[PDB]
């Protein structure tokens, strides 16, 4: 077939991973022991993506859970099905990394490193025909962050041909107070332009900005924050998951969604937080961003849109060029065609159609600058900087992280402003 | 019918040449393309090398 | 003997190869299991429809088709379908990883690990035949694999077939129903690289074909098998003279004699009438003359252009079933001098006529009204580079920026293909417009 190998790594890694699995382990009708207890072949069509099948018929995720601290990997087996996992899996250390980057990167992540890719080829050579692997981590800790982006590394040269997908989670003030986090974001960042295909970047900025303002959730737990992420997690995958007429595997959909190699850091969203006409309207309105930037600010270089649910797909199509028509100023006009819709007449659980939103936009340079003012504030100051040159690390390789994501910003605001003639 | 022959036998002939370089130059390019990516990825490994190295330097 | 190999590459080449053949066997009375009750010659025989079909000593008689995709799971559907008892395993090949969109995968990295064997599967039919006339390719100007391996293989076939002639199916790209933003790109790279091993390309507008299921059949929101069906009457066709014998009858190559005036203008627009819903068709016989007059009105071409600002270069005309041509020159002679018909100045201006008796075939369960007679018109138009035109524009928009194009160079290709390519097509739409010039 075509399977994933899914990696999970970290505090923020494991909790978004967790709950991923609970909504499509829901789906596809399989419950915490493994068997299947459905209603429709369609929920098994694709089941090789996310599982092994095994004796007595026991579909297992192809998950591998990672940590530099065992407390949160506990917390996994013990919650909603932790039993289903492969049990050889679970690969923790116990000198965690102190929201560390180079602990996670260059000295205690590069000890445990070895032992995870073990797993990773356990599982991958097991499969018909490996699409990739996707990896959900946080760029703010020091474990889904550092050694997360070591592991990217790593696979990248055992696997050079197969997609590298991330869930990335960036950091903000509003929710946790740690302070080195600029620090740990843009030397992720500085590793991930170089050694993955496809990075959502999923923002706490603006996940909080929607729970408290939309949801009208003050006080906000983590597990609000996720249960909107696993939310987008579900609906980006559910075209891999689901047979509709859309058949692409991980390569194609990154061929048509990634025109420059480094820009490939997407924006998504969600609808609702109805008719066919307000969720379009919705999704593409910027309140229902999981990045913290406005569209409308940038250009959108290329568009996924996934709507589930029964509905009038005639509808569907008339609204996609009903939106385009009237923001045209902001997709740029020498990609032709750069907005794909897909439509899974499945819809998620409690929703009898919701809308996903994935998004190609120079806009997102605004995250960027962001991230980038919190760092250079720190950074010529030098504060909490013995932290890293502790565990053996240069001035230099600040710097370079620094300008190599200065470069990016304005590679995406070249794009911006380009035009067909 | 002789100036026919020659000139199917050139078509198929320079046809098969055509290809094959295209192969060719398809395969070395492919090939430059992967080892320059492991190359990058293997002056990683020196300087993380360099940087448990260097900590080692430290105490 | 003239036997015709159908090669179906890619899904959409291997869909409407699965809408194609089950459309033969229907017009030819040939049972899922292959079994024709009608022929009486068991193992073997000359008859006309042997150009596509051989026969099993068991009485199976079996595509001379091979598909190819460099993924299992289209072709899986043939391997489990209806028609499944109708292929030898052997002329169903796949591959595990397909093209993903891309040109070069399709052409070099994926490609070049199944050509071999597909050549050896190729050979396999042409040994079975006494008198080979040639291959129909059936494929997707926007798929890696459609566009990619079919230039692969059409640059193999030319080697090892020498002008042995190589006809195409093409599916131009429409954005109603493309996965992909680089079909631009593989359509331009295919049609350079394919032009010197192709004799004669029908292209088929995915997007003319949308509008006409939506606008004669009314289906809302046509899908795949909408289109294909539709597409399945077209190509039998152009095909029931290869497959059908009767005195009227006029066999396809005598057709391209007329539609190829020189190598590289060999692109004919393909019109189709009627096109009608079994609720219009009650109570309303279209004549030959009414079908006739739809030919010339391009909603129902195969591709987006306009004839009309164009010259013609050839027209042939296509009839199947009750039509004889005391109807035929009445109805043309009223076109004559009716409509926008321009020929160029080097060109005689008559309409080439032929007749199959076999009446059109409906599969069951579709949208189209089976109807007494059917016609297919097949002109060489300048108006069809209006389709190279949108193309290599949308072509252009892109590769100034070399969007996208990073994916092609990470598989072995280069700048230089690109535009050299796109060279060509340019050189191609030049040509178009000179054989419309007037001479002096
Ligand atoms: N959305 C979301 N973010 C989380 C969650 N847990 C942690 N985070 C984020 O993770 C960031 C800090 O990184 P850590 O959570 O410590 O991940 P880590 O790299 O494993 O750090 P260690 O505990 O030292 O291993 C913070 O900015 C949090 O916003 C969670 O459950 N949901
Ligand atoms: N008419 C018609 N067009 C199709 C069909 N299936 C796919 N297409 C068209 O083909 C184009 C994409 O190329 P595909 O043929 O799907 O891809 P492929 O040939 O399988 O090659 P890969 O990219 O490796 O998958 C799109 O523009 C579609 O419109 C079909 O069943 N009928
Ligand atoms: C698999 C698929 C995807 C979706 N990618 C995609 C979709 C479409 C597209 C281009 N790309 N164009 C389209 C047009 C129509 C419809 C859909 C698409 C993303 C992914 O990344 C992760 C990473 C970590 C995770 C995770 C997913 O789930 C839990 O943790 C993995
Ligand atoms: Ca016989
Ligand atoms: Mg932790
Ligand atoms: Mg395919």
Known sequence: ?421 | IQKAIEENNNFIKMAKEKLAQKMESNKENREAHLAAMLERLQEKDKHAEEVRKNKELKE | ?440
């Open chain 1, 1 to 421: 077939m075509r399977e994933i190998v899914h990696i999970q790594a970290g505090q923020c890694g494991n909790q978004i991973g967790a709950k991923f699995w609970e909504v499509i382990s829901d789906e596809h009708g399989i419950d915490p022991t493994g068997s299947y207890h459905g209603d429709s072949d369609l929920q098994l069509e694709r089941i090789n993506v996310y599982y092994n099948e095994a004796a007595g018929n026991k579909y297992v995720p192809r998950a591998i859970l990672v940590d530099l601290e065992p407390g949160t990997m506990d917390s996994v087996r013990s919650g909603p099905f932790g039993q289903i996992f492969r049990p050889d899996n679970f690969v923790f250390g116990q000198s965690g990394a102190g929201n560390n980057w180079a602990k996670g990167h260059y000295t205690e992540g590069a000890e445990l490193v070895d032992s995870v890719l073990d797993v990773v080829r356990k599982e991958s050579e097991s499969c018909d025909c490996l699409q990739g692997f996707q990896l959900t981590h946080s760029l703010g800790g020091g474990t889904g962050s550092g050694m997360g982006t070591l592991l990217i590394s790593k696979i990248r040269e055992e696997y050079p041909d197969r997609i590298m997908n991330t869930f990335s989670v960036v950091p903000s003030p509003k929710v946790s107070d740690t302070v080195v986090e600029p620090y740990n974001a843009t030397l992720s960042v500085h590793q991930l332009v170089e050694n993955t295909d496809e990075t959502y970047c999923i923002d706490n900025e603006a996940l909080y900005d929607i729970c408290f303002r939309t949801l009208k959730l003050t006080t906000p737990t983590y597990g609000d924050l996720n249960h909107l992420v696993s939310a987008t997690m579900s609906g980006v995958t559910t075209c891999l998951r689901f047979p509709g007429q859309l058949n692409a595997d991980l390569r194609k959909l990154a061929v048509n969604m990634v025109p420059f190699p480094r820009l490939h850091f997407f924006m998504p969203g969600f609808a609702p937080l109805l008719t066919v006409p307000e969720l379009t309207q919705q999704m593409f309105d910027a309140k229902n961003m999981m990045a913290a930037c406005d569209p409308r600010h940038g250009r959108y270089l290329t568009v996924a849109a996934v709507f589930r649910g029964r509905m009038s797909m005639k509808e569907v199509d008339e609204q996609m060029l009903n939106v385009q028509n009237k923001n045209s100023s902001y997709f740029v006009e020498w990609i032709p065609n750069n907005v794909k819709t897909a439509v899974c007449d499945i819809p998620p659980r409690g929703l009898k159609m919701s809308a996903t939103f994935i998004g190609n936009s120079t806009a997102i340079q605004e995250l960027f600058k962001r991230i980038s003012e919190q760092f250079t504030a720190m950074f010529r100051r030098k504060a909490f900087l013995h932290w890293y040159t502790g565990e053996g690390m240069d001035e230099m390789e600040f710097t370079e992280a620094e300008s190599n994501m200065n470069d990016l910003v304005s590679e995406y605001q070249q794009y911006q402003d380009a035009t067909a003639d």
């Open chain 3, 1 to 440: 003997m003239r036997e015709c190999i159908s090669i179906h590459v890619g899904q959409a080449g291997v869909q409407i190869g699965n809408a194609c053949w089950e459309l033969y066997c229907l017009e030819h009375g040939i049972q899922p299991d292959g079994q024709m009750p009608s022929d009486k010659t068991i193992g073997g025989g000359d008859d006309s429809f042997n150009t596509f079909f051989s026969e099993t000593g068991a009485g199976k008689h079996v595509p001379r088709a091979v598909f190819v995709d460099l993924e299992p799971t289209v072709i899986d559907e043939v391997r489990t379908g209806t028609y499944r008892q109708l292929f030898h395993p052997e002329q169903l090949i796949t591959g595990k990883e397909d093209a993903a969109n891309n040109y070069a995968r399709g052409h070099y990295t994926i490609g070049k690990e199944i050509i071999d064997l597909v050549l050896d599967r190729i050979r396999k039919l042409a040994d079975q035949c006494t008198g080979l006339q040639g291959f129909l390719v059936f494929h997707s100007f926007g798929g890696g694999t459609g566009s990619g391996f079919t230039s692969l293989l059409m640059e193999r076939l030319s080697v090892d077939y020498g002008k042995k002639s190589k006809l195409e199916f093409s599916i131009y790209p429409a954005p109603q129903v493309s996965t992909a933003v680089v079909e631009p790109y593989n359509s331009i790279l295919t049609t350079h690289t394919t032009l010197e091993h192709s004799d004669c390309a029908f292209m088929v507008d995915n997007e003319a074909i949308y509008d006409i299921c939506r606008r004669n059949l009314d289906i809302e929101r046509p899908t795949y098998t909408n289109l294909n069906r539709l597409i399945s009457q077209i190509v039998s066709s152009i095909t029931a003279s290869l497959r059908f014998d009767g005195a009227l009858n006029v066999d396809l190559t005598e057709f391209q004699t007329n539609l190829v005036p020189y190598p590289r203008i060999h692109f004919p627009l393909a019109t189709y009438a009627p096109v009608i819903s079994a609720e219009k068709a009650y109570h309303e016989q279209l004549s030959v003359a009414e079908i006739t007059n739809a030919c010339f009105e391009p909603a129902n071409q195969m591709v987006k252009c306009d004839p009309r600002h164009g010259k013609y270069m050839a027209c042939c005309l296509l009839y199947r079933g009750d039509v004889v041509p005391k109807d035929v020159n009445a109805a043309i002679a009223t076109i004559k001098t009716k409509r926008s018909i321009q020929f160029v100045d080097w060109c005689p201006t008559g309409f080439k006529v032929g007749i199959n008796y076999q009446p059109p075939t409906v599969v069951p369960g579709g949208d189209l009204a089976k109807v007494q007679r059917a016609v297919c018109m097949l002109s060489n138009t300048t108006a069809i580079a209006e389709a190279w035109a949108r193309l290599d524009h949308k072509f252009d928009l892109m590769y100034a920026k070399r969007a996208f194009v990073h994916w092609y160079v990470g598989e072995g290709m280069e700048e230089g293909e690109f535009s050299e390519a796109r060279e060509d097509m340019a050189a191609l739409e030049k040509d178009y417009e000179e054989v419309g010039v007037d001479s002096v």
